[PDB]
PDB file of C-alpha atoms and ligand atoms in Angstrom:
ATOM      1  CA  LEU A1015      -5.061 -10.309  -9.297  1.00  5.55           C
ATOM      2  CA  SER A1016      -3.717 -10.907  -5.815  1.00  6.60           C
ATOM      3  CA  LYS A1017      -2.699  -7.199  -5.826  1.00  5.84           C
ATOM      4  CA  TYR A1018      -4.951  -4.460  -4.574  1.00  4.28           C
ATOM      5  CA  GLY A1019      -3.865  -0.944  -5.380  1.00  2.07           C
ATOM      6  CA  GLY A1020      -4.178   2.453  -3.847  1.00  2.54           C
ATOM      7  CA  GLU A1021      -2.217   5.526  -2.785  1.00  2.00           C
ATOM      8  CA  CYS A1022      -0.021   6.208   0.208  1.00  2.00           C
ATOM      9  CA  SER A1023       0.103   8.982   2.821  1.00  2.00           C
ATOM     10  CA  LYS A1024       3.589  10.326   3.468  1.00  2.00           C
ATOM     11  CA  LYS A1025       2.538  11.977   6.750  1.00  2.00           C
ATOM     12  CA  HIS A1026       0.948   8.806   8.150  1.00  2.00           C
ATOM     13  CA  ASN A1027       2.974   6.155   6.304  1.00  2.21           C
ATOM     14  CA  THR A1028      -0.239   4.378   5.271  1.00  2.21           C
ATOM     15  CA  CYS A1029      -1.596   2.803   2.099  1.00  4.52           C
ATOM     16  CA  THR A1030      -5.291   3.141   1.282  1.00  3.06           C
ATOM     17  CA  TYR A1031      -6.164   0.328  -1.148  1.00  2.00           C
ATOM     18  CA  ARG A1032      -9.330  -0.868  -2.879  1.00  2.00           C
ATOM     19  CA  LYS A1033     -10.550  -4.432  -2.285  1.00  2.00           C
ATOM     20  CA  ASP A1034     -14.044  -5.971  -2.436  1.00  2.00           C
ATOM     21  CA  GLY A1035     -15.661  -2.594  -3.180  1.00  2.00           C
ATOM     22  CA  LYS A1036     -14.179  -0.970  -0.055  1.00  2.00           C
ATOM     23  CA  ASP A1037     -11.154   1.102   0.833  1.00  2.00           C
ATOM     24  CA  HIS A1038      -8.803  -0.243   3.477  1.00  2.00           C
ATOM     25  CA  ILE A1039      -6.064   1.730   5.247  1.00  2.00           C
ATOM     26  CA  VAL A1040      -2.981  -0.286   6.269  1.00  2.00           C
ATOM     27  CA  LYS A1041       0.361   0.931   7.577  1.00  2.00           C
ATOM     28  CA  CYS A1042       3.123   0.788   5.029  1.00  2.00           C
ATOM     29  CA  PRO A1043       6.313  -1.002   6.058  1.00  2.00           C
ATOM     30  CA  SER A1044       8.874   1.012   7.962  1.00  2.00           C
ATOM     31  CA  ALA A1045      11.568  -0.462   5.670  1.00  2.00           C
ATOM     32  CA  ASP A1046      13.533   2.146   3.763  1.00  2.00           C
ATOM     33  CA  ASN A1047      12.615   0.938   0.254  1.00  3.12           C
ATOM     34  CA  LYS A1048       8.960   0.120   0.969  1.00  2.00           C
ATOM     35  CA  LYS A1049       7.729   3.031   3.176  1.00  2.00           C
ATOM     36  CA  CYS A1050       5.753   5.955   1.778  1.00  2.99           C
ATOM     37  CA  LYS A1051       8.445   8.444   0.741  1.00  2.00           C
ATOM     38  CA  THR A1052       6.398  10.336  -1.876  1.00  2.00           C
ATOM     39  CA  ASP A1053       2.943  11.527  -0.932  1.00  2.00           C
ATOM     40  CA  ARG A1054       0.183   9.811  -2.953  1.00  2.00           C
ATOM     41  CA  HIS A1055       2.577   7.260  -4.427  1.00  2.00           C
ATOM     42  CA  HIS A1056       0.960   4.097  -5.710  1.00  2.00           C
ATOM     43  CA  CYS A1057       0.894   1.340  -3.140  1.00  2.00           C
ATOM     44  CA  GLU A1058      -0.284  -2.277  -3.147  1.00  2.00           C
ATOM     45  CA  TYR A1059      -1.500  -4.913  -0.744  1.00  2.00           C
ATOM     46  CA  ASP A1060      -0.554  -8.301  -2.126  1.00  2.00           C
ATOM     47  CA  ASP A1061      -2.801 -10.944  -0.578  1.00  2.00           C
ATOM     48  CA  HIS A1062      -0.692 -13.766  -2.089  1.00  2.00           C
ATOM     49  CA  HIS A1063       2.591 -12.652  -0.492  1.00  2.00           C
ATOM     50  CA  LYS A1064       0.711 -10.989   2.439  1.00  2.00           C
ATOM     51  CA  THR A1065       2.715  -7.775   1.965  1.00  2.00           C
ATOM     52  CA  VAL A1066       2.326  -4.047   1.600  1.00  2.00           C
ATOM     53  CA  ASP A1067       4.631  -1.888  -0.498  1.00  2.00           C
ATOM     54  CA  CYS A1068       4.343   1.911  -0.743  1.00  2.65           C
ATOM     55  CA  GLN A1069       7.158   2.148  -3.319  1.00  3.47           C
ATOM     56  CA  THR A1070       5.670  -0.045  -6.018  1.00  4.30           C
ATOM     57  CA  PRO A1071       7.694  -0.190  -9.288  1.00  3.11           C
TER      58      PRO A1071
HETATM   59 CL1  LIG B1113     -15.399   1.934   1.851  1.00  2.69          CL
HETATM   60 CL1  LIG B1114     -20.127  -3.256   3.796  1.00  6.23          CL
HETATM   61 CL1  LIG B1115       8.997   6.927  -3.555  1.00  5.37          CL
END
Protein backbone atom coordinates (compact mmCIF):
# COMPACT_ATOMS: atom_id res chain seq x y z
CA LEU A 1 0.00 0.00 0.00
CA SER A 2 0.83 3.68 0.26
CA LYS A 3 -0.14 3.39 3.97
CA TYR A 4 2.33 2.56 6.68
CA GLY A 5 0.87 1.71 10.04
CA GLY A 6 1.86 2.01 13.63
CA GLU A 7 0.72 3.25 17.03
CA CYS A 8 0.53 6.71 18.53
CA SER A 9 1.78 8.26 21.78
CA LYS A 10 -0.80 10.39 23.56
CA LYS A 11 1.84 12.09 25.74
CA HIS A 12 4.04 13.06 22.78
CA ASN A 13 1.42 13.28 20.02
CA THR A 14 3.58 11.09 17.76
CA CYS A 15 3.00 8.14 15.44
CA THR A 16 5.61 5.39 15.24
CA TYR A 17 5.08 3.58 11.92
CA ARG A 18 6.80 0.72 10.09
CA LYS A 19 8.26 1.34 6.62
CA ASP A 20 11.13 -0.35 4.75
CA GLY A 21 11.95 -2.59 7.73
CA LYS A 22 12.40 0.37 10.10
CA ASP A 23 10.30 2.28 12.59
CA HIS A 24 9.86 6.00 12.05
CA ILE A 25 8.50 8.48 14.61
CA VAL A 26 6.57 11.44 13.16
CA LYS A 27 4.47 14.05 14.94
CA CYS A 28 0.77 13.54 14.54
CA PRO A 29 -1.26 16.51 13.32
CA SER A 30 -2.40 19.00 15.93
CA ALA A 31 -5.86 18.95 14.28
CA ASP A 32 -8.64 17.90 16.63
CA ASN A 33 -9.78 14.84 14.64
CA LYS A 34 -6.32 13.60 13.63
CA LYS A 35 -4.17 14.06 16.80
CA CYS A 36 -3.39 11.19 19.17
CA LYS A 37 -6.29 11.27 21.64
CA THR A 38 -6.10 7.61 22.75
CA ASP A 39 -2.74 6.22 23.76
CA ARG A 40 -1.51 3.46 21.41
CA HIS A 41 -4.23 4.16 18.86
CA HIS A 42 -3.50 2.95 15.35
CA CYS A 43 -1.93 5.60 13.19
CA GLU A 44 -0.83 5.77 9.55
CA TYR A 45 1.60 7.63 7.36
CA ASP A 46 0.16 7.80 3.87
CA ASP A 47 2.97 8.41 1.39
CA HIS A 48 0.47 8.98 -1.46
CA HIS A 49 -1.41 11.81 0.27
CA LYS A 50 1.73 12.78 2.31
CA THR A 51 -0.31 12.77 5.54
CA VAL A 52 -0.31 11.42 9.05
CA ASP A 53 -3.46 10.50 10.95
CA CYS A 54 -3.48 9.29 14.57
CA GLN A 55 -7.26 8.70 14.55
CA THR A 56 -7.45 6.20 11.72
CA PRO A 57 -10.94 4.71 11.10
CL1 LIG B 1 14.37 0.59 13.20
CL1 LIG C 1 19.55 0.74 8.08
CL1 LIG D 1 -9.08 8.44 19.34
